[PDB]
């Protein structure tokens, strides 16, 4: 009896579940993939991610702490903004807190910024000095203007991560978004994949249930190997 | 011969969006109606494209053009049901908003190094920035955090003729928001959409979806009007 083994398959490059949704759109278009498995380091599968989860993950009600929940690292805004870092908290993995741009004065900021927050900024050292002062645990500078020694001094002994990126804030704010790591956007469960041990007789029986046009194809020990269309 | 035309087999009724639909209640649709693609038609119910996630995706993750609200005529009325604004003052000349978004972060005098004649301004509750907003003729001042504006202000814009609104939204929330106003005939698969005709053969459709290989298929009747979708086969 013929197993999906037996069948020929789409060779695919399944993303880490660290791999920011910037990245992993950049894949999927650079490839024409629709949808891509998303495994870990030993190449397991974990998940698929597709435009149907990205665009869901943008219409959808933003939880105001998604990078927290997400645990969104500052590799991943770094890229996503093209961003550098001029201090880093190191002993950091996670920002807590929910992202603000800082448009008020500086007297203001308290009232809508807290502690933990992630906080969108001019090059203003007056609004900077301040974000540094509430312990925001992000402050993104905009505009490509990093900021002065003194700044970044005040930083230093706060512990507190500063990047510059040289978008302005309207873009920036667009543009954290796909930061997101993969793995907490991804179908997870009720993905289906098929192994190359199932008879294809009984494959043809399971495609028939659901509808999806490619199935990811993993062995006997829950490997990648990977995917073949309807 | 007597042969099977698409108009015998099953299809998926839809209704389709006008063009002028914004993304956002696109999406609403879509995810209701439980579709991952819906025809696009005219006032006459001809096709003029598709909207998928896969084009959605494709604008909502392009950043570079900060010029989108003019590049795709985008309304007055999406943005307000986008941003769950209301209108103080409207400029009922003006169709087209044509210069970039930009929040409108930094101090009074400083606004006119970003921020410029025709430009969309998003802007907090400080009289003194919506005023010089005004007066640098931005073409759209929204303002942020549900702070209605003056009547003063209100009646500066008036006299000027600039378009101010207002949402409950704060800067961050109103800037990753407001492409989802986009109208869907800007984001659409337009070029190399392929339909089907009521009146096609079975036999030759089954051809063209093998070229193509696409999940499902717009349907559009003898006289042009979409009439709803067909699976592949
Ligand atoms: N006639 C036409 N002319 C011109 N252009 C056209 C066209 N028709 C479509 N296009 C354009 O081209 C794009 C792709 O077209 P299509 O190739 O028709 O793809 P699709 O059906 O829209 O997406 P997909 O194949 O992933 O849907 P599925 O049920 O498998 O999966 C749906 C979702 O479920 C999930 N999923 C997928 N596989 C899964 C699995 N094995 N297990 C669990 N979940 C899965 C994924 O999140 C996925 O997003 C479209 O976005 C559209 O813009």
Do not use: C
Not at 98 to 103: D, N, R, S, W
Not at 116 to 132: K, Y
Not at 144 to 168: F, M, Q, R, W, Y
Not at 201 to 210: A, H, L, N, W, Y
């Amino acid at each position: 009896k013929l197993k999906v083994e037996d069948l020929e398959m789409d060779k695919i490059a399944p993303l880490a579940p660290e791999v920011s949704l910037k990245m992993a759109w950049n894949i999927m278009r650079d490839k024409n993939l629709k949808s891509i498995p998303v495994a870990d380091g030993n190449n397991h599968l974990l998940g698929m991610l597709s435009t149907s989860n990205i665009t869901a993950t943008y219409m959808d009600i933003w939880d105001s702490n998604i990078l927290a929940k997400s645990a969104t690292s500052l590799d991943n805004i770094l890229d996503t903004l093209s961003a550098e870092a001029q201090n880093i908290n190191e002993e950091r993995k996670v920002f807590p807190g929910k992202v603000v741009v800082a448009a008020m004065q500086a007297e203001s900021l308290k009232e809508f910024i807290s502690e933990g927050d992630i906080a969108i900024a001019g090059d203003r050292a007056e609004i900077q000095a301040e974000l540094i002062e509430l312990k925001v645990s992000l402050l993104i500078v905009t505009g490509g203007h990093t900021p002065s020694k003194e700044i970044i001094e005040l930083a230093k002994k706060n512990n507190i991560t500063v990047i510059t990126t040289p978008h302005d804030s309207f873009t920036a704010s667009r543009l954290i978004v796909q930061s997101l790591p993969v793995d907490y956007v991804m179908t997870k469960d009720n993905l289906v994949a098929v192994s190359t041990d199932d008879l294809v007789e009984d494959v043809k029986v399971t495609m028939s249930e659901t509808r999806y046009s490619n199935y990811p194809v993993i062995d006997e020990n829950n490997k990648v190997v990977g995917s073949i269309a309807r």
